[PDB]
Amino acid sequence: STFRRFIEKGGEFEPEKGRYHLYVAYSSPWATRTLIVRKIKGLEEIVGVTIVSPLFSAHGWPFGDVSPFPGAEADPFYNAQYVRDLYLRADPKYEGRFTVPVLWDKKTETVVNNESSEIIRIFNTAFNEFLPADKAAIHLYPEALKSEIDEINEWVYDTVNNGVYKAGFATTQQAYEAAVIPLFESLDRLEKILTGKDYLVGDQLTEADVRLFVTIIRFDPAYVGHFKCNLRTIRDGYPAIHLWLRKLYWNNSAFSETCKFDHIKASYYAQKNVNPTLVVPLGPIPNILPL
Amino acid sequence: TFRRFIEKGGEFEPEKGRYHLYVAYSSPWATRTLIVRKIKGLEEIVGVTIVSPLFSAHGWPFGDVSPFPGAEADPFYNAQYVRDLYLRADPKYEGRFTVPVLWDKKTETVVNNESSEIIRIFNTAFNEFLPADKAAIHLYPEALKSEIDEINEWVYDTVNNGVYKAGFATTQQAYEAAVIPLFESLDRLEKILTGKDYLVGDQLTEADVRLFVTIIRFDPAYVGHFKCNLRTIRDGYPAIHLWLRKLYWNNSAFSETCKFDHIKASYYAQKNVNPTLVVPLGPIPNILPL
């Protein structure tokens, strides 16, 4: 992701309320990281959000007027029709991918940052002056845990967050197996790390939990079937992960209110090179088991 | 469209060494006939050839044409595909070239290609060639017939065929119309099997065989490939799961004829459903132990 700017006093993007805006899809785990952290930090009235349609098209992510879907929205600001229109508005010569999330500056009309790992760090502190004391104190990447967080993020990112895509979009048996086996070795390892624990790092919520969560919450509903990540399921094969996952989802509204299983399943099962019939399976039931 | 039987004085006299089964291990319909062949001890009475599970543009190939571990060449006619057997029996045949085929080596014709009828043939037609214990086995006894028929009717419509209706449906509507009655019928079977080892009459019957070939393939293939995924057998249906495991692990007719590699190779090669042709490595294991 090639827009890697920050929101800093004296910088290109001064910290301000009502200036920065998030464009996301609910289906995207990467974009959902930023929705979760926006709710954790109480930024709803400080950073706006627009939900694009989960029905990825030949021109990328459409807005809700181009591709209607419950909860999908039109672009409020530029009559943008696809997320690529924002990128091209920011820079008509842009040649990257037109991905979500997009953290957008309404003032200069450009992309501040389109790397979810950096957007959620911006949110830890950039806006604290505008927050009540209890929200401003939250920091999901604190100094004392950074190195431990980075270490677990590195292999989670490689073998789990991206591992499910490597397996699901593999077009050869060999490439599928090379992705799916390390994926489940890493789940085995996460199962041990989370045994008897509520959080991955430091016995508190950190961005490591957010980054793992957005993949694990999509695992039984979409990755098992559609991406063939089916050696076992979270709910039946990984009790410590299952418990950690259900505590986050059911006990923290930041994780459930930003989790739209209908968007999730609609985006994945409309990937016609994997699932040409475009049928959306009705299971699993439920999307996530109760505590 | 071949619905003949094997009877004393009839067109197809009961004999040892004359009739031959052509089957694919992947096919639940053909596997019915493999299971009963073993239940009844017919292995040296009715021969068997295993076709390649790698279904082709020309239908089921033989093992020399499309090699796969355990797939065999046609021993009799150098047939390349199962359709070559049908066209030898009837050059004008216009049905589907399906397995199983119960074949007469003497007159070179298809006796019967309905798995539901082949397994009833195997109940009695060959008893004169069997030891007493195998000859006494009957999977469709008169006393249980009506109960077997009743459960077979909705198992056939909603479960045996239902997984296919769900998996090959090309619209959301048709997929939902199949998958919902499938799981309603699993719910119904779950109640039937709670505290029981067999569907009917507290003994093994063809009703068990006909259900087994679907359920044994459910977690390994139907859940994923055919989207039959409201819940799994092993985690969602304990009574079915127990019944299934007792058949598989305690009756070697059910395990010796169960080739999970053939099953998964055939289904996941179905390019109109799974264009990448990738075969998933899970679920692990194919069937959980007792």
Ligand SMILES: O=S(=O)(O)O[C@H]1O[C@H](CO[C@H]2O[C@H](CO[C@H]3O[C@H](CO)[C@@H](OS(=O)(=O)O)[C@H](OS(=O)(=O)O)[C@H]3O)[C@@H](OS(=O)(=O)O)[C@@H](OS(=O)(=O)O)[C@@H]2O)[C@@H](OS(=O)(=O)O)[C@@H](OS(=O)(=O)O)[C@H]1OS(=O)(=O)O
């Ligand atoms: O954002 S883009 O820059 O990529 O816009 C382009 O759109 C197509 C290229 O992207 C891919 O589209 C298909 C589905 O999108 C998925 O993309 C990735 C999968 O790797 C998923 O998430 S993520 O990258 O990890 O963030 C994405 O998001 S999510 O998980 O749902 O949240 C998916 O939705 C995909 O194929 S498909 O099965 O859905 O049909 C990819 O095809 S492939 O199997 O890898 O080969 C495809 O790369 C391009 O359009 S397309 O018609 O080829 O599919 C492209 O258009 S093109 O260059 O003219 O060909 C981009 O649009 S454009 O440049 O503006 O015209």
Ligand SMILES: O=S(=O)(O)O[C@H]1O[C@H](CO[C@H]2O[C@H](CO[C@H]3O[C@H](CO)[C@@H](OS(=O)(=O)O)[C@H](OS(=O)(=O)O)[C@H]3O)[C@@H](OS(=O)(=O)O)[C@@H](OS(=O)(=O)O)[C@@H]2O)[C@@H](OS(=O)(=O)O)[C@@H](OS(=O)(=O)O)[C@H]1OS(=O)(=O)O
């Ligand atoms: O036995 S046949 O007479 O049918 O030989 C023909 O082969 C093709 C037509 O059959 C089908 O092939 C594809 C897959 O086969 C599956 O068939 C059924 C699925 O409904 C499965 O089980 S069942 O016994 O009917 O209950 C079968 O068995 S099993 O579960 O593995 O045990 C499957 O393996 C199938 O699609 S797919 O595999 O590519 O995804 C069907 O296509 S469709 O999705 O329904 O639209 C197809 O009907 C024909 O060849 S083909 O190239 O179209 O695929 C056909 O050749 S043709 O006339 O030229 O078109 C038959 O071959 S031929 O007459 O000898 O030439």
